[PDB]
Design a binder for this molecule. Structure first.
Ligand SMILES: Nc1ncnc2c1ncn2[C@@H]1O[C@@H]2COP(=O)(O)O[C@H]3[C@@H](O)[C@H](n4cnc5c(N)ncnc54)O[C@@H]3COP(=O)(O)O[C@H]2[C@H]1O
Ligand SMILES: Nc1ncnc2c1ncn2[C@@H]1O[C@@H]2COP(=O)(O)O[C@H]3[C@@H](O)[C@H](n4cnc5c(N)ncnc54)O[C@@H]3COP(=O)(O)O[C@H]2[C@H]1O
Ligand SMILES: Nc1ncnc2c1ncn2[C@@H]1O[C@@H]2COP(=O)(O)O[C@H]3[C@@H](O)[C@H](n4cnc5c(N)ncnc54)O[C@@H]3COP(=O)(O)O[C@H]2[C@H]1O
Ligand SMILES: [Ca+2]
Ligand SMILES: [Ca+2]
Ligand SMILES: [Ca+2]
Lengths: 92, 92, 92
């Protein structure tokens, strides 16, 4: 794919508050992470929030979790993050 | 992560009709499932539909499939569901 | 699930330019692929783009990558694609 032999990619799905999405996007950019943002809404409170999709090399997962924790995360705020396996990664 | 040693999380991606999204969200809440909703659109009919993202413990996958089937699912209606593996789950 | 014993599904997540989303949706339809579309936005340029979710049988992954490459993909344009494992696939 676009990944060198011997490494792996993960997919980060991070659900954060709308009021923090701006700060996270900027800090991901500063740190050379790529991201795609989704305007979403919560099942329980039924209010808008933001979901980021971040494809990242396995080697940098701790690093990106750290960024999410610093910029988002809690009485208020908070971030919910899933790390998911990726079979292949391509750019066309 | 946020998961006890010995268990695993799965990611449920459920594509349902807009007119059923309200009923599913309420029944997931009643049953202590967390969810994130995405306004989406179908590739074929090119009309709005709703996509839910639900992170759930492996032990409760049958339970949540049952909820989706009861609230959504078909001449009309219907639900399309993917169950996907999750490496880790965090809250910050 | 909805998958015959011995095969597997993959989840394709494809991020493409808005101006190409129409052409991809039509070519996926012609080729008997199902798809769900998400209006998204890029982390870096902060402009609208489109994310497709495509559940596909393992046997057809090369085929669908080929469609994405032909319709989207680059001085301009371009497509970013993740192939992800799927545990189960259901329709209700
Ligand atoms: N396992 C999971 N799978 C998929 N998406 C997830 C998820 N956990 C969280 N999300 C998303 O993160 C948002 C904030 O979750 P949080 O747990 O920090 O904060 C939650 C939580 O404190 C509480 N909450 C949610 N469901 C609850 C429940 N059944 N009982 C009591 N409190 C609940 O209300 C707040 C707002 O939740 P809301 O649904 O509106 O919005 C949630 C949801 O969109
Ligand atoms: N493998 C998959 N991967 C990713 N997303 C999936 C998917 N299967 C379904 N979805 C999503 O679920 C929606 C309803 O699918 P359903 O199969 O029940 O009902 C479908 C199906 O009955 C039919 N349909 C879709 N594609 C077809 C095709 N190539 N040939 C004949 N009928 C098709 O039109 C209805 C509307 O489909 P639409 O695309 O507008 O919207 C679809 C799509 O957004
Ligand atoms: N690993 C990944 N994980 C999750 N989503 C991904 C991703 N790679 C790309 N995407 C999505 O695809 C869109 C186009 O990416 P592309 O790499 O072809 O083209 C990129 C790339 O040429 C450049 N770019 C992005 N980040 C950069 C950075 N940190 N430094 C230099 N150039 C960057 O700006 C263009 C626009 O990127 P933008 O973020 O606005 O929008 C991106 C993003 O939404
Ligand atoms: Ca802010
Ligand atoms: Ca209804
Ligand atoms: Ca076009």
């Amino acid at each position: 794919g676009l990944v060198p032999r011997g490494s792996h990619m993960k997919m980060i799905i991070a659900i954060v508050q709308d009021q923090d999405s701006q700060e996270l996007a900027d800090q991901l950019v500063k740190n050379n992470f790529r991201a795609t943002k989704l305007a979403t809404t919560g099942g329980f409170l039924r209010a808008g929030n933001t979901t980021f999709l971040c494809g990242v090399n396995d080697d940098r997962v701790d690093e990106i979790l750290s960024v999410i924790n610093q910029t988002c995360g809690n009485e208020v705020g908070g971030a919910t993050v899933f790390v998911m396996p990726v079979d292949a990664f391509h750019q066309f």
